Design a protein around this ligand. Structure first.
Ligand SMILES: CC(C)(COP(=O)(O)OP(=O)(O)OC[C@H]1O[C@@H](n2cnc3c(N)ncnc32)[C@H](O)[C@@H]1OP(=O)(O)O)[C@@H](O)C(=O)NCCC(=O)NCCS
Length: 163
């Protein structure tokens, strides 16, 4: 009769309707869900950690069993620290599927307790790629269809300065 806690890591740069769907799904089936934002020190994300967490909070705060936290280092260690039952990943048609198996199996070798549990998002979200979203925004196009309003405004606000 133990509580479920799943960790959903990613860069969420920025969060998309697809990510929202997934979290919504996950919130319905796990007791607690942690939206885990990888800082990306060596990665160089467009949006800052604060901006990413803010935007996630805005699109998913209404779910009461959803936490939001940034993290670096090893997902396996974050997993341990958070006393997590499993790491959640999404699985679309566009997904590097062998590349989920590498992640999953290598992490298992680092920690035999590590478990991974994929969910698939509503078919309308099977084709959107944050890379393309960011590119469309950059070229002053409409991303209203692919990300929450808050994110759309973030994009303007990013144009409006330079960082
Ligand atoms: C954090 C981590 C899980 C993320 O990898 P990932 O599956 O690519 O997920 P990310 O958050 O990196 O997302 C990267 C890409 O996935 C894509 N993506 C995944 N789900 C998506 C969705 N629902 N909608 C749109 N794009 C999506 C995007 O194209 C994204 O591109 P971006 O780099 O512009 O954001 C992985 O890098 C990690 O675990 N790092 C921890 C460090 C570690 O342990 N390393 C060794 C593990 S063996």
């Amino acid at each position: 009769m133990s509580k479920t806690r799943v960790i959903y890591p990613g860069t969420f740069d920025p969060i998309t309707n697809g990510h929202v769907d997934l979290v919504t799904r996950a919130s319905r089936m796990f007791d607690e869900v942690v939206v885990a934002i990888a800082i990306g020190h060596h990665k160089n994300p467009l949006f800052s950690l604060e901006e990413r967490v803010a935007l996630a909070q805005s699109s998913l705060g209404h779910l009461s069993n959803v936490e939001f936290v940034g993290f670096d280092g090893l997902l396996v260690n974050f997993f341990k620290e958070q006393k997590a039952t499993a790491v959640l990943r999404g699985l679309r048609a566009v997904s590097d599927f062998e590349y989920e198996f590498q992640l999953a199996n290598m992490n298992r070798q680092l920690d035999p307790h590590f478990e991974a549990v994929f969910l698939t998002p509503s078919e309308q979200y099977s084709f959107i790629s944050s890379t393309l979203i960011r590119e469309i925004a950059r070229l002053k196009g409409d991303v209203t269809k692919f990300v929450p309003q808050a994110v759309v405004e973030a994009f303007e606000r990013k144009h409006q300065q330079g960082w």
